[PDB]
Amino acid sequence: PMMSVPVLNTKKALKRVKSLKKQLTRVCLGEVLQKIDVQEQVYQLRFQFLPHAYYQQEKCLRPEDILRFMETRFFKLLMESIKKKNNKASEAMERRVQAVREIHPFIDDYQYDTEESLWCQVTVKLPLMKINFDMSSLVVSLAHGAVIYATKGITRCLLNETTNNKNEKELVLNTEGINLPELFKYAEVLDLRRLYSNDIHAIANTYGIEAALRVIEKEIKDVFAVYGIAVDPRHLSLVADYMCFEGVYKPLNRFGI
Amino acid sequence: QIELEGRRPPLMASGKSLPCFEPYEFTPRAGGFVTGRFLTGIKPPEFFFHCMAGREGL
Amino acid sequence: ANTCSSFQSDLDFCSDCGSVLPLPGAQDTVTCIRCGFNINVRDFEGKVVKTSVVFHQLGTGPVVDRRCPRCGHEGMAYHTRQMRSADEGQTVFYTCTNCKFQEKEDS
Amino acid sequence: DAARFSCPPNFTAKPPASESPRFSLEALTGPDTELWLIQAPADFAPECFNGRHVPLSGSQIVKGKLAGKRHRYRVLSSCPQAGEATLLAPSTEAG
Amino acid sequence: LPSARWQYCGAPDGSQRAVLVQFSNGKLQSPGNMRFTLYENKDSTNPRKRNQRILAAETDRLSYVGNNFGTGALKCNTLCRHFVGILNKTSGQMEVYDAELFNMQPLFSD
Amino acid sequence: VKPKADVKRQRIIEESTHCGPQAVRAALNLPEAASYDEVRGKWQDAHLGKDQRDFNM
Amino acid sequence: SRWRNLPSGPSLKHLTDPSYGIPREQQKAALQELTRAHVESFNYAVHEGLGLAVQAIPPFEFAFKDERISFTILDAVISPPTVPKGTICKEANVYPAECRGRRSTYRGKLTADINWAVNGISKGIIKQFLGYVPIMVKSKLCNLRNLPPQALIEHHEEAEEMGGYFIINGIEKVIRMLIMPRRNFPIAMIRPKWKTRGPGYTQYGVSMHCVREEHSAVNMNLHYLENGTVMLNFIYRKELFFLPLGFALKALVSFSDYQIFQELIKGKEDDSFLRNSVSQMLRIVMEEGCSTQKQVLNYLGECFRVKLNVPDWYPNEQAAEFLFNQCICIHLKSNTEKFYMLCLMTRKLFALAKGECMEDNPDSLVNQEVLTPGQLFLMFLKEKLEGWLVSIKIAFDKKAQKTSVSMNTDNLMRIFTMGIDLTKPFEYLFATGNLRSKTGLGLLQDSGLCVVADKLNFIRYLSHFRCVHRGADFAKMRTTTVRRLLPESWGFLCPVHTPDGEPCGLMNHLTAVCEVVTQFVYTASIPALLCNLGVTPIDGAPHRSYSECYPVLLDGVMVGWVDKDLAPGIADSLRHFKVLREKRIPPWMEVVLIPMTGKPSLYPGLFLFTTPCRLVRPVQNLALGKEELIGTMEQIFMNVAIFEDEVFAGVTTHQELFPHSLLSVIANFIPFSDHNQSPRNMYQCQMGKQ
RNA sequence: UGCUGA
DNA sequence: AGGACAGCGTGTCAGCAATA
DNA sequence: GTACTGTCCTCTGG
């Protein structure tokens, strides 16, 4: 899936877009990590996060937000997965630690890193009888699908500088995901008329069916264009009018009959 | 330049593309760059890559 | 015996899970030693420094392009693929420079 | 009760050798004595090394003569690895 | 590099053999409390049986048995040969003897 | 093909037999030079990798 | 050699020679070496392999009345074709010239001598006539063997024929070399459809294809489960059975859990997920009830007794041995060797799972071998002999269960009552091509096994004895990756000679210099030589750390752990022996040494194959100039120049015999194939056969 | 079911 | 109501042998 | 082969 919104051609918009591109790319716990150190029924875990030199440049992240993420989402999804396994097996440092263990009954105390996330570990223990194995497997299969924050549906943006020779000045913010409403907030940075997507079900849900007809036609035309073939527009018009006849984008297949 | 799947000919499991070539050989010849022509025929290794391509076509 | 701890060091087999009382309770030759060993096992481990890292990773396609026009002029670029049978000839894939318009001839 | 090994009827216990004072525990525990384990191919003839200087460290090729034919044997010497075969010796202390 | 002069004093008739033991479950923490008994086959007329031997080790808790015949006899006793070298550090002379290796294992009967 | 035109073709084919190291190296973003065996190892790693998108590069 | 006296430029003064029509004294010898793999395989299958096949053949004991009867087959013998009974006259022999005139099968008589006993003190040796088995043409059980071209013309034969085929109803079926995975070698595979085999299975596993003396094949898969545990899948009679490892390891060896564990952690004695997962395999399912070898054999016996169809009076411990003998590691006689082989295949799944090793492509010829006409023939013969025993004693048990004392009067009238079987079953596999077997013979294909050999031309005919079919099932596949012409089939398969439609990439042909191995040797003094060379036996004292050591294998049997700084010299010494024909190293042993680095390269170790179905090809061994033979897997770790002046000092270990060695026999008949485009030259190969 | 032709 | 999953699907074009 | 429909399957809402 993809998108392509032109950039509005104003000096302020060009400056804001850099931040916009850096704002919609997904940053995942796994993309920001050096290596874990698991000790094992008392299972400790130190994350040892990366320095900002080589990941803050194009990800727009800060260490307090990243660490706060572990306290509220990763360190409880960890107990969620531990239960997933164990159900079928047979002055200020203080408030943060306290609220965090207010909510869970297993953790004991983590750490603090007053100097750029120096050493940030945690400790757990299930004292009676649990399957003591290399649980690093779980806390590694989980530290990959754990994403700090991302716009739903968008996996990465990119500004393909030039798209025109006639009015070469055009800039395009292409994307490799699809979320139409999460771009409506930038009607001053980007041109939301001229927004395009190859989805045809998302266009049909944000703009209607008469707007999905033309996306269908343009998609078929651009599919044939990569080979030099050129079907006459009068044929794609009829195909798109038949497909979208009864208000919905209906497939041309066994369930359409 | 021979291209099979949009990529150069595949390597073996040991890192050589053909029994004649050292493993992980940098020369473009080892990756399917045929500098021979049908006027003066192509050597055996180039013959091999050309056959790979002509067969994937079918 | 002067050996690994998960088994019945002096005797034959492997012990059972070290849970409760002495060993606890093996099947053959139950002979019991060290209700609990001294040090809980220290397993020092680490993870990969290639994939997850953005540290320690700081340091260590136009074709041959012959001349034919479609929209403008002055030099396309071609990839040859034999997308045909053994009784036919090789198809050619051209691409422009000023723009990016792909051709896909038959020969 | 330990089921005590029971010797099959066709076997008899071999007495110690009181005519063996060489492999005696006393002889082997002498301050000037070192024990070495040697592993060789099944067809190895140890006499082919008689008088020759076998290495006590590293790797060396040693030449031997067997039945008129020259053989060369690569000899590897190492530090005992935990779990190696233990030599048994007769002991007066053990009855 | 340190070297030793090799001598095979060995066995007078080759009837004489030393005895090496290896335990399948690791190292014995206290080999000093073990009593080893070597058993030989009474049949000295059958060349096949005359070299059959059993080594038994008894502890307070368990018994170990090794044999040079049958499944318990392992390949290393033949494909390779084992020797024991006795090195005199003072003379630099190594006396070499034939050795027999026994793989020891635990004793239980139904 | 004319002679005196196949000589240029032959010299260009001779020149083309020296363009592998630079190509691969400058695609692995390796130190610009001084590595002649780190490049083979990096190529091998990229080849036995799981993702296999640093190999297509 | 065997490629000398190859003409340097063609001549035309052989036609127009005063001796053009005079039949020659001996046959051509270059045409003979084309069907040589089809004939030398059958020669073993019918004389030396048949005795071994019948030797396995467990004695078929069963219950009659209140009696237990044992029937064993002491020998089976196939006789050359001959006039049926003596009812005919003037010539006992029967030459293939007829059965082409008439439309009949060239079939020889298969007869065995069974030996039936009642408790082992009452016995009599009867000689039953099993049936008729088809015969190849110049196969040592045929009447045209040892005939010069002049005597081959008075019988109506081609004077230049190399048979290598069967005449089933006068149609000359040409059973062709199918491709099998490999034999007696563990191939580590990453197949994602494996996790559907159970609740916690992963997409990792080492498969092994085991063949014993060319009469039996079996496929066993060791699967990795997410817990760190390994399972074993075996197939008996087309049913898949899953046994946790540990049940298998404890049964095979009367060893403690400590030496066993110490074996599966040999090279990774610092890893702790492994050390913990090995203990879970030994304790979780085996300290749960069975801790002595017999109790494990007893438990395994009770669960599997129903589907192994064992005798009712068999102890459960005896039914377990039946499973291990007939389903896991057929190739190895010992149970101690079967343990060490299951342990190296596991040590390998742990390395594939931890990404320390590269999956072996099953579609590279490195990990492939061929199925010859003799392997299919014996593997069907043995199965049909077992079926004959079973049927005769079905009839036995079913007739009367009556006082066998006087029933020793009709014992032969009983055995003959079911000896009426073995003939028609055999002709179906040859006349139709498809296989009807209780066990598919460890094959994976049940059709297209034999095909019609048509003499439209002599270039259509000669290409039936050099064809190699990847498989008949791959003709139905969305993905096209078994049709890729990888660079590992250099010198073993022709790039150009492939059908150019639906069979493309699936039906290949051998190059002119390539050849199938078919000889069988002793290979008993090899394990004792490897130890002289520097190997240390599996038993112990490696002299290093089990991680700086190479695991040595020789035909499924792990000799064990040549040191890491002695592996190169050992491989070079072994290669010099095979080249100069010293020791007893077969001229065709493949000494492979897959080096080990820190990279995820193919699993390290020194293999040494000498089995009878691998492809080999000649290459001029430089530094000796002695015409070595290299194999598909041994060719990936060596440089082989083509033209001289391409040979260098350190590089170019070997050199190829002729520059056109890469091309097939037919592709060598196309003139100037170098100046035509490749889809054309491949087309020439399909048009020269029509 | 093995082949073959566009 | 978040799923888990079992369940249908198609697949250019004509000949010959031969045999169910 | 993958992706669809389908099919419940039964988990928190009045």
Coordinates of C-alpha atoms in Angstrom, one line a residue, chain A residues 26-36 47-51 54-55 59 61 66 69-70 74 77 138-149, chain C residues 47-55:
Chain A
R26 CA 8.0 3.5 13.1
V27 CA 10.5 3.2 16.0
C28 CA 10.4 -0.3 17.6
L29 CA 12.0 -1.4 20.9
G30 CA 14.0 -3.7 18.9
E31 CA 15.4 -1.0 16.6
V32 CA 16.7 0.7 19.8
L33 CA 18.5 -1.9 21.9
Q34 CA 22.1 -3.1 22.2
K35 CA 21.8 -6.5 24.0
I36 CA 19.9 -8.0 26.9
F47 CA 18.1 -3.7 28.4
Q48 CA 21.3 -1.6 27.8
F49 CA 19.8 0.9 25.2
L50 CA 21.7 2.5 22.3
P51 CA 23.4 5.9 22.5
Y54 CA 23.1 7.2 15.5
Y55 CA 19.4 6.7 16.1
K59 CA 13.7 8.8 14.5
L61 CA 12.9 9.9 20.1
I66 CA 11.7 5.3 25.6
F69 CA 7.6 2.9 27.6
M70 CA 9.3 -0.1 29.2
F74 CA 6.9 -3.7 27.9
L77 CA 3.4 -7.3 28.2
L138 CA 10.4 -15.1 25.2
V139 CA 11.9 -11.7 26.1
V140 CA 13.6 -11.6 22.7
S141 CA 10.6 -12.8 20.6
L142 CA 8.8 -10.0 22.5
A143 CA 11.4 -7.2 22.2
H144 CA 11.0 -7.3 18.4
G145 CA 7.2 -6.8 17.9
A146 CA 7.3 -4.2 20.6
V147 CA 7.2 -0.7 18.9
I148 CA 7.7 2.5 20.8
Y149 CA 5.1 4.5 18.8
Chain C
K47 CA 22.8 -10.5 22.5
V48 CA 23.7 -9.7 19.0
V49 CA 25.6 -6.4 18.2
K50 CA 24.8 -6.3 14.5
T51 CA 21.0 -6.2 14.0
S52 CA 19.5 -4.3 17.0
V53 CA 22.4 -1.8 17.2
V54 CA 22.7 1.7 15.7
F55 CA 26.1 1.7 17.6

